């Protein structure tokens, strides 16, 4: 047995199946976006989710083409359904290293893109403090030609001193996610709340949105309102979901 043929066999198969965790505003409010996380439907041991295989994935070099079918799979569930998500909806994806390598990330946002009505979508790609730390002159023109496009970064595991924010002037970043460790421990750990305040005032710096991630209680989304943090995921809001339970969701908001 080939654990990469099984990841190509499943691929072939569509297997690889997206789910939707809706954004919501830090004041409250409708769904601003949904961020899509890649399950694996197995026919076997079930629904997987994608830090069991991600990395694998990664190491086996199947994580572009199976990126690359993941967003084909949400434009054609999505790019139908325009009226039922209100003009400037996000909808993210977990781009890994080697996807920002190349330049066909281009042609993959384009073609995504392209599958709704001109600016009716924001497309907003996450991917961590190392790929501008160790970047080349292909990251400097896929960056350049992605935010052309309209596309958005965000940025998770930064540093929030001025090392940190030189790179992230440079390559003109647009979102900093708060890690849910940290949410997790608000009106817990004086420290944690320090750092999730150092985050803020990185934000504040270069004018930045703010994802907060693991918000599941009231006092963690209060706390986090309060600071002006933009948009909010987590339990509270909503677990991953697959698309008949977001267009049952969304039918319902477009009331």
């Known amino acids: 047995a080939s654990p990469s043929s099984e990841l190509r066999r499943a691929l072939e198969a569509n297997?690889?199946?997206?789910?939707?965790?809706?954004?919501?505003?830090?004041q409250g409010g409708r769904w601003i976006g949904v961020e899509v996380l890649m399950r694996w439907r197995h026919p076997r041991e079930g629904l997987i989710r994608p830090d069991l295989f991600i990395p694998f994935a990664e190491r086996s070099g199947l994580i572009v083409p199976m990126t690359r079918a993941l967003m084909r799979q949400?434009?054609?569930d999505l790019g139908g359904h325009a009226g039922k998500l209100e003009p400037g909806f996000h909808i993210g994806f977990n781009i890994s290293a080697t996807h920002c390598h190349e330049l066909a990330l281009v042609d993959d946002c384009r073609e995504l893109l392209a599958a709704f009505p001109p600016g009716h979508i924001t497309l907003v790609l996450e991917l961590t403090e190392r790929e501008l730390i160790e970047s080349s002159e292909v990251t400097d023109r896929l960056f350049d030609e992605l935010h052309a496009l309209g596309v958005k970064i965000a940025i998770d595991d930064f540093g929030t001193g001025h090392s940190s924010l030189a790179y992230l002037r440079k390559?003109?970043?647009?979102?900093?996610?708060?890690?849910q460790s940290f949410v997790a421990r608000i009106g817990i750990d004086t420290l944690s709340g320090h750092i999730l305040d150092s985050i803020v005032e990185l934000?504040?710096?270069?004018?930045?949105?703010?994802?907060?991630e693991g918000v599941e209680t009231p006092e963690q989304r209060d706390y986090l309102a309060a600071r002006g943090v933009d948009y909010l995921q987590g339990y509270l809001i909503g677990r991953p979901m697959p698309l008949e339970s977001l267009l049952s969701s969304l039918t319902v908001q477009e009331q």
């Open 171 to 179: 390559f003109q970043v647009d979102c900093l996610k708060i890690d």
């Open 15 to 26: 297997e690889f199946i997206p789910y939707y965790q809706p954004l919501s505003p830090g």
């Open 74 to 76: 949400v434009a054609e």
């Open 203 to 212: 934000s504040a710096k270069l004018d930045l949105d703010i994802v907060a």
